[PDB]
């Protein structure tokens, strides 16, 4: 029994889903951490069967989804939950969605797990460029997209079997300036890649757990489409399929099969690394055309 | 008349001072941005003559200090100033110390300038390791040590002559895990090096201004001694003078002479770069001993 | 069925062997390309069933060696073998061992294969430190460790089905200086990784073939003892096992299971990358002690 | 007085010349090491006062060429010149042009100098793309562009006072693939930068001598047109001037004033570094358009 917690999903159009699918080929149970705001709306789509076709894992199998619970990366413990969300229309019919509350939840219901996934981000001012991003907008970006990874590791390590494995998703915007990826998402990802190394030493020396991050390429997910900058996301994909070393179309399951491998023991000697699953676009410099 | 604003100084034991000295050899006027909490205490040391010896620039000259004004990197505009600092014992006898307020101040009193320096940092939980750092502690670190650089550029660009030059100071802790540099200072510096590139494109494309950051090595400054981790700082220096390619002792004026050059036109073609002034320690891998 | 040519094995103590072992678990047909100097002696020990307990794959499997051929990566085509080597005591008996003749031989007896492994290096002056390496040895190191790959790629890409994968081994000493790794080796690995980028480009766009390189930690191989500097390899294994995030002995099969992943469809979205398999050593700057 | 040997100048259109120009502003004595093929013709144009308007240093100065010697970096010592080149039409007249003989010659007529500039490269197959480069040309490229430095360093370090500085030129195509930069050049620059690290180590610890390398943007030099791919160099200059953060034509003197800084005490704390002087192109991933 392998339980993998995938924190960061909304539909079946993102990386978490592509991550979950590939893992199922290994028959790992899947628990989904969903942002409260789209939880029920997600749960609803689930109950009606909108994901049934999207769940038929290759190897003639259904995607064994252990559970799907509310989860919010910008809240550590139950007392960080302010009066606002306390009232916020949706949050009302939901509870125990703070990072530590889900850890306790999953650990009480199913116990120790051995694979953790951080597939979530958000930069409220992504549309403004760094130079025009506020302190609130930026720090919020880091809090949601960077620190969470740390917070998650702090509370979840406790319920993880020895030698578990953690992964996150990052963007090359962090190493080379890619115009239009603003509001702190560059700063954020830059830090998330650095903290990967630092956490890699702590988690590995003390608990002997590994942690790495995947630097994916363009993907038409709700977040990517929601960016808005014929859309930032549509421009990155066009460019990629045209200039990337590998001419084919990048699939979520592409990052999924890589995540699958990095979350296994077949990679026991790899940690604190940033693995590029971007068809090789990251190696290029000046485009031919 | 070259006016350089150096934001981040407390005594004459840090990099800003080593920065200012080297610049004076070029007869550039110096304006000091000082943290309110140590402003007057700094001003006092200044009036008594505790810095007179520390100001005798090589080339038989005094260090022409245009001014020294209160400055706080964790406050952008005058309205971000909360009721706390509003009351805080010290702040009381000080005003116009928000990033935009000093910009306006310096611009009204002396006008356009052409060299900007970001020599300041602070991580309230530096003593805890990443995995044990809070959200407050971390984000505060980023706000003080990372976003400020951006905020500073946003407000100061306006009063800068065409083709000005900006620099900041960063630490290799950002690229390779160096135990004991916690509380977010690794995450912080990682982002400050990334945002350097992104700001490098904006500032350079739009205003034709350059920005780079210096990756210094160990220096026994109040901040370094204040870290506490025979002290983190004493261990880094011992190690460096023993294994670094260049066997000599690293001086603030070392980073100073490099800052001097990067803040000039003699480097007009360099931007968005992280220059290591660490005697080469950063090139090593495994130490001989 | 997947066929893999491992150009490197010269006994079970290095990565060459480990890689082979692991590829077998996945049931791929191997084909060793042994170097003439050690070809006679290897077959010998193979017949005497010495490697028998070494061809032990946990899953009560027995390695599946398909063919075993003499192979010297110094020669591109049969016209490059000189007279002396042509008439050497160890070579006389053997034949068709050039990079072109083994490629045809392989394509003749089995057809197109779809996995190329490069696990070889040589540097006559590995002992002498860079400064005192001769132009002769230097060019010999690259010719042997660097070029050998490029030429394997040119000639072997014509017997490789689309989507087939290639890989090679490298050492961090190219990115970070490790005293003692001389004779032009650091230089050679610096080229192999850059070349891995350029090649991943041409091979991608043209043949839909991927190429990557694994940066392995230390393993006591025949070749590692050759390095004389408890020698160099024993200091490296000791330093590593005490300072890497993961404190477990780095097995050769660990690099093996990673070569296997790269060599398969699982990694179809990765090319031109230097993936570190080394228990995380590369992410460290300063030590714990 | 500072003496600098610039091994590279073959006419005023490249970085070699620009570097020389700038070093003069600082009043350093230069010494050109011209290649035999172009030695006769260079002296010619020099006597005819053609470079006269080119030796124009803004400050109404007139360049200060000290000596001008034939120099071929292919040969380490006089025993390496072969018979044919020894008897070639362009070489017969000349003498003492090996890396060892020019070093003694320089030390004999002037004594120890304290600034070594390496501004040369060659690759017979720069035109052909990596995959189709021969072992011969490849080894020739490195022997010419890579090794040449290491050997200059060994022999010249004995006529260089402590704290003296060395530098060389490189191109980003080593870190990022730029189609068209072939014949083993990318590979060569990949070695030069790694070697810059190793050398900066041995030279530091031993001779207190620093060594760095400048990664310059595109400049239309004799050698850049040799590259046939508006050719390769004109596409590079055009792409650069339109996408680099700084949109100004990249002068050779800009790389020059940076070589001058590195070559002086100002940078006494920097070694083993690849400093980019290229208007910021290297920090870009995707383009604006
Ligand atoms: N699409 C791409 O081309 C691409 C490329 C490189 C990296 N990535 C990264 O992949 C990861 C997954 O994103 P995706 O693009 O597949 O999109 P996605 O839309 O499926 O996932 C984003 C998720 O972030 C979560 N989120 C935001 N704020 C949160 C909070 N406070 N608490 C909890 N969850 C919160 C949401 O639940 C949402 O499902 C992201 O980190 C993203 O940056 C994506
Ligand atoms: N000492 C080293 O070995 C070393 C190495 C690499 C990088 N650096 C960097 O050099 C820079 C300068 O530090 P230093 O080490 O010379 O020490 P320093 O003690 O002189 O300077 C630190 C300054 O940060 C300022 N600061 C903190 N919070 C602030 C706020 N909210 N608003 C305004 N100012 C604030 C203080 O005024 C203080 O003078 C730092 O960014 C530091 O990280 C130092
Ligand atoms: N052992 C380590 O700690 C370590 C670390 C990093 C990288 N590597 C790399 O691992 C790879 C394999 O080396 P290993 O360390 O396992 O040692 P190894 O001694 O098992 O492998 C080297 C093999 O290459 C063959 N060889 C040498 N020159 C050859 C030529 N011209 N043509 C054909 N074969 C030739 C020899 O038969 C020998 O078996 C190399 O590329 C090496 O650089 C090893
Ligand atoms: N022009 C650019 O855009 C550009 C960009 C990046 C790096 N570089 C580098 O700049 C440096 C100088 O090249 P340049 O582009 O100014 O061209 P250049 O043609 O002026 O310089 C090359 C010079 O080296 C000499 N040369 C060649 N082989 C030699 C040998 N064996 N011994 C002695 N001298 C030899 C020639 O006389 C020639 O003048 C090179 O190292 C090159 O790689 C140039
Ligand atoms: N607010 C926000 C912005 C962008 C996001 O994901 C990404 C989408 C596309 C690309 Cl190219 C890189 C990304 O990191 C996510 Cl998940 C949230
Ligand atoms: N809160 C805090 C912690 C560390 C600081 O400066 C540094 C001191 C020493 C080193 Cl090695 C690297 C640094 O960045 C500064 Cl300036 C503030
Ligand atoms: N002549 C020679 C020298 C060293 C070799 O392999 C290596 C051995 C040990 C390490 Cl640490 C790194 C390596 O690349 C190989 Cl395979 C051949
Ligand atoms: N045979 C040859 C080929 C290219 C050369 O220099 C260069 C010219 C242009 C660019 Cl973009 C990068 C370079 O390194 C030099 Cl100097 C010699």
CATH of the domain at D20: 3.40.50.720
Tokens of D59: 């400050």
Question: What is the DSSP annotation of A79-133?
Answer: TS--HHHHHSTTGGG----BHHHHHHHHHHHT--EEEEEE-----TTTTS-GGG-
Q: What is the distance between the alpha carbons of residues B144 and B188, in angstroms, rounded to a whole number?
A: 9
Q: Which atom of ligand 1 is nearest to the CA of A216?
A: 6
* φ, ψ of residue D26 in degrees (nearest 5): -80, 0
Query: Which among B139, B196, A154 has a CA at the least distance from the CA of D276?
Result: B196
**Structural domains in chain C (count):** 1
Q: For tokens 């020894």, name the residue.
A: D86
C163 SS3 class: strand
Q: Is B190 on the interface with C (CB under 8 A)?
A: no
Q: Is B246 annotated as a binding residue?
A: no
- Extended strands (E) in D37-159: 56-57, 61-62, 65-70, 113-118
Q: Do C287 and B284 touch (CB under 8 A)?
A: no
Nearest residue (CA) to ligand 6, atom 11? B218
Q: Rounded to the nearest whole angstrom, what is the distance from the C-alpha of residue D140 to the centroid of ligand 4?
A: 15
Q: Which residue of chain C comes nearest to B286, CA vs CA? A: C178
Q: Find the A263 Cα to ligand 3 centroid distance in Å.
A: 29
Nearest to D200 among B245, B260, B261 (CB): B245
CA triple C78-C80-C85, angle to 5 deg:
95
Q: Which positions in chain B touch C282 (Cβ < 8 Å)?
A: 176
Residue D20 CA to residue D12 CA, distance in Å, equals 10
Cβ-Cβ contacts under 8 Å for D222 (sequence gap 6 or more): D10, D11, D13, D14
- Phi first, then psi, for residue B6 (nearest 5°) are -115, 105
Q: Which residue has the tokens 């006027």?
A: B29
Closest CA to B242 of B231, B234, B251: B234
Ligand 4 pocket: which of D14, D21, D259 to mutate (most atoms within 8 A of CB): D14
Distance between Cα D7 and ligand 4 center (Å): 9
CB under 8 Å to A64, separation ≥6 — which residues? Answer: A24, A27, A29, A30
CA closest to D254 among chain B residues: B269
Ligand that lies nearest to the alpha carbon of residue B168, given by its number in the listed order:
2
Cα torsion C219, C224, C229, C235 to 10°: value is: 10
For residue D250, the distance in angstroms to the closest alpha carbon of chain B comes to 7
Q: How far apart are CA A183 and CA A145, in angstroms?
A: 12
Distance CA A244, CA A254 (A): 15
- Nearest ligand to the CA of B74 is 2
Task: Tell if the CB–CB gap between B247 and D204 is shorter than 8 Å.
Answer: yes
A218 C-beta closer than 6 A to ligand 5: yes
Q: How far apart are CA D118 and CA D196, in angstroms?
A: 12
Tell me the residues of chain A between 79 and 118 that have a Cβ less than 8 Å away from chain B: 80
Provide the token pair at A42. Answer: 């997600």
- E strands along D90-227, which residues? 113-118, 160-170, 210-216
> Which uninterrupted H or E stretch holds C214?
strand C210-216
Using the mean position of ligand 5's atoms as its centre, give its distance from the Cα of residue A50 in Å: 24
**Residue D170 vs residues C9, D15, D186, D238: alpha-carbon distances, Å:** 36, 11, 9, 19
Q: Which residues pair with B65 in a beta bridge?
A: B30
* B161 in Cβ contact with B263 (< 8 Å): no
Determine which one of A97, A171, A201, A235 is catalytic. A171
Closest partner CB to D261 (pick from B245, B266, B272): B266
Q: Collapsing DSSP states into helix, strand and coil, what is residue B107?
A: helix
CA C189 to the chain's CA centroid: 12
Which of B39, B91, B155, B171 is catalytic? The answer is B171
CA distances A182 to A84, B223, B272, Å, are 27, 31, 17
DSSP B284: B
Breaks in chain C after residues, C-to-N cutoff 2.5 Å: 229
End-to-end CA distance of chain B: 50
Residue nearest to atom 7 of ligand 7 (CA): C224
Q: Is the CB of B9 under 6 A from ligand 2?
A: yes
C187 touching D (Cβ < 8 Å): yes
Give the range of the structural domain holding residue A53, as residue numbers without chain letter: 1-289
CA of A125 vs chain C CAs: smallest distance (Å): 30
CA distance D73 to D98: 7
For residue B133, CA distances in Å to B129, B138, D71 come to: 6, 6, 60
The residues, any chain, with a CB within 8 Å of residue C44's CB and separated by 6 or more, are: none
**Does D77 touch chain C if contact means CB atoms closer than 8 Å?**
no
CA torsion, ordered D78, D79, D83, D87, to nearest 10 deg: 10
Nearest to B35 by CA among B77, B97, B115: B97
CA of B261 to the centre of ligand 1 (A): 42
- List the subunits that have 3+ CB pairs under 8 angstroms with A: B, C, D
Is D131 in CB contact (< 8 Å) with chain A? Answer: no
C-beta separation of D231 from D223 below 8 A:
no
Run of H or E residues at C27: none
Please tell me the number of Cα atoms within 13 Å of B90 on its side-chain side. 12
Contacts of B257 in chain D (CB under 8 A): 265-268
* End-to-end alpha carbon distance in chain C: 50
Q: D257 φ, ψ to 5°?
A: -65, -15
Among residues D138, D155, D181, D276, the one annotated as catalytic is D181
CA distance B27 to B63: 8
D110 is an active site residue? no
Task: Tell me the C-alpha distance between A187 and D94, whole Å.
Answer: 58
Q: Please calculate the CA angle A9-A15-A20 and round it to the nearest 5 degrees.
A: 75
- Helix ranges, D208-251 (H): 222-226, 231-243
Q: Is A247 on the interface with C (CB under 8 A)?
A: yes
Name the method of structure determination. X-ray
Residue D39 bears catalytic tag: no
Q: Name the residue among B89, B262, B233 with its Cα closest to residue B173.
A: B233
Pocket probe for ligand 4: among D54, D119, D144, the residue whose CB has the most ligand atoms within 8 Å is D119
Name the nearest CA neighbour of C37 among C15, C5, C70: C70
Q: Which SS3 state, helix, strand or coil, does residue D2 take? A: coil
Q: What are phi and psi of C16, to 5 degrees?
A: -50, -50
Cα–Cα distances in Å, from D242 out to D235, D246, D249? 11, 9, 10
* D45's tokens: 């144009």
Cα separation, C187 vs A210, in Å, equals 31
Structure tokens at D233: 């160099």
D172 touches chain A (CB under 8 A): yes
A50 is in an annotated binding site: no
CA distance A102 to A106: 6
The two three-digit tokens of residue C265, written as one number: 């469809």
Q: Which two tokens stand for residue C98?
A: 């050039």
Q: What is the bridge-based pairing of β-strands B274-277 and C3-7?
A: unpaired
Cα distance between residue C2 and residue C26, in whole Å: 9
Nearest one of D216, D195, D214, D212 to D271, comparing CA atoms: D212
């Amino acid at each position: 029994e392998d339980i993998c917690f995938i924190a960061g999903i909304g539909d079946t159009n993102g990386y978490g889903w592509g991550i979950a699918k590939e893992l199922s080929k290994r028959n790992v149970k899947i628990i989904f951490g969903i942002w409260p705001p789209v939880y029920n709306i997600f749960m609803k789509n689930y109950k009606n069967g909108k994901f049934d076709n999207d769940m038929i894992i290759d190897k003639d199998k259904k995607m064994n989804i252990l559970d799907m619970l509310p989860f919010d990366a910008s809240f550590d413990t139950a007392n960080d939950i302010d009066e606002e969300t306390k009232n916020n229309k949706r949050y009302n019919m939901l509870q125990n969605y703070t990072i530590e509350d889900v850890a306790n939840l999953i650990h009480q219901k199913y116990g120790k797990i051995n694979m953790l996934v951080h597939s979530l981000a958000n930069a409220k001012e992504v549309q403004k460029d760094l130079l025009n991003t506020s302190r609130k907008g930026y720090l919020d970006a880091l809090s949601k997209s960077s620190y969470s990874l740390i917070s998650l590791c702090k509370y979840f390590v406790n319920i993880m079997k020895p030698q578990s494995s953690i992964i996150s998703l990052t963007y090359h915007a962090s190493q080379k300036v890619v115009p239009g990826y603003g509001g702190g998402m560059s700063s954020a990802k830059a830090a998330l890649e650095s903290d990967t190394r630092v956490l890699a030493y702590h988690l590995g020396r003390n608990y002997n757990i590994r942690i790495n991050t995947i630097s994916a390429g363009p993907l038409k997910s709700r977040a990517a489409t929601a960016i808005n900058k014929y859309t930032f996301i549509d421009y990155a994909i066009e460019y990629s399929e045209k200039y990337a070393p590998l001419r084919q179309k990048l699939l979520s399951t592409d990052i999924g099969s890589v995540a699958s491998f990095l979350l296994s023991r077949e990679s026991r000697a790899i940690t604190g690394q940033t693995i590029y699953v971007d068809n090789g676009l990251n190696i290029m410099f000046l485009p031919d055309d």
